[PDB]
Ligand SMILES: O=CN1CCNCC1
Ligand SMILES: O=CN1CCNCC1
């Protein structure tokens with residue numbers, strides 16, 4: 206069945222806990238596989254040691270730029286970018302896991318976890334999972350954001366991987 210993966214997150218070197226994500230490989234297998242492999246680091250690169258670089262309260266927590274750490278970077282396991290697989294899953298509420306992008310067909314490694322229903326992103330961002338456990342950790346991360354997206358603490362994915 207669908208993979209379960211985890212992100213262990215620090216703020217300013219202090220552990221916040223673990224976010225567990227279900228990846229909906231049954232609906233978006235290519236997008237799920239990219240995220241899964243970036244969590245395990247099995248291709249030689251991935252999310253471990255990278256940051257949540259953009260966090261907006263009452264919106265989203267964004268991460269996955271493991272090359273430039275500022276929202277410009279990241280890459281997929283397939284190449285620098287890959288197409289929007291489908292828009293079948295919707296941004297239904299807090300806990301939705303979705304791909305960040307710079308327009309159509311520009312998925313790399315950047316992603317976000319929603320903290321509200323972000324319905325205006327339906328048909329624009331590929332939803333590929335949701336938070337199974339650790340929404341408390343997501344809301345802690347959210348609390349360290351700002352309207353500009355700048356974080357008030359350094360938010361680091363200290364470890365990540367696959368649970369099943
Ligand atoms: O959350 C929606 N899902 C539908 C497809 N199976 C995975 C779970
Ligand atoms: O609460 C929803 N919002 C929309 C996005 N900007 C932050 C507030």
Ligand SMILES: O=CN1CCNCC1
Pocket residue numbers: 259267275276277305306307315
């Ligand atoms: O801050 C990261 N960004 C990458 C996704 N598109 C908007 C800017």
Ligand SMILES: O=CN1CCNCC1
Pocket residue numbers: 265267304305306307317326
């Ligand atoms: O690419 C990710 N984004 C976060 C949600 N708003 C649009 C840009």
Ligand SMILES: O=CN1CCNCC1
Pocket residue numbers: 276277278279286305306307311312313314315
């Ligand atoms: O906003 C820039 N990005 C780099 C390519 N992956 C999507 C986000």
